[PDB]
Amino acid sequence: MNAPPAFESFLLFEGEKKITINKDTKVPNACLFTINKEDHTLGNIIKSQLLKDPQVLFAGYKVPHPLEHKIIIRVQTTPDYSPQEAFTNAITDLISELSLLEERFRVAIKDKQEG
């Protein structure tokens, strides 16, 4: 009766924004990113990539409730560097790694079959 439809976990409805940017006023150079209709599949990669950056002092994510689909990411970086730049660089590096991985897997398939 009160069952939400299955597509509500990945479909943005009328009005919902994918990502909203808010600042953190407790500590300087901190920022919070709220992502709607996402889960650990993206949160974990983005966090682990942010931690590789030597100019990132804090990088975490959490899902506030398992029944409500929303991801919150918090990143604080050293001065003369902004968390938005850290986030964008992280996404770019992830895309580059995935593209290289796909290329190498395709060549490995080609070597394995008929070779």
Binding site: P54, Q55, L57, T78
Partner: protein, 148 residues
């Protein structure tokens, strides 16, 4: 400076009562030229220690080699001051008790400073003259380095 204490120790026991914890062992060291007993808990997985070892112990109120304090806030992107990175094992604690050998009238001749490194305790007995740098609730670093 900021170095409250500095001496070379020798390990006499690792667990006189028994292996209480999997990854933590309690050294029972004795000094040399100071006659100061030590009881220190050391993470043995990260920093293995066995019997008969000699290490140089330094207890300093700051790590920055100039005098300024650290405020206790962690920051790894601060290699500029060139902290005391000549040691192998470094811990960070807070002295929580200074027992003594006082009485009603006579003053103390032997002290005993306890420091808690976030769970891993330490007691450092000895004479009351070279143990004067310790005041309770004060943050303290510990630095170890095994001598070959």
């Amino acid at each position: 400076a900021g170095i409250l204490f500095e001496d070379i120790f020798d390990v006499k026991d690792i667990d006189p009562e028994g292996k209480k914890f999997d990854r933590v062992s309690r050294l029972h060291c004795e000094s040399e030229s100071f006659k100061m007993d030590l009881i220190l808990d050391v993470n043995i997985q990260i920093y293995p220690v066995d019997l008969g070892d000699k290490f140089r112990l330094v207890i300093a109120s700051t790590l920055y080699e100039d005098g300024t304090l650290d405020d206790g806030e962690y920051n790894p992107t601060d290699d500029r001051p060139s902290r005391a990175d000549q040691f192998e094992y470094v811990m960070y604690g807070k002295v929580y008790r200074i027992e003594g050998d006082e009485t009603s009238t006579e003053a103390a001749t032997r002290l005993s400073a306890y420091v808690s490194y976030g769970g891993l305790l330490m007691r450092l007995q000895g004479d009351a003259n070279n143990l004067h740098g310790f005041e309770v609730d004060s943050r303290v670093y510990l630095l170890m380095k095994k001598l070959a």
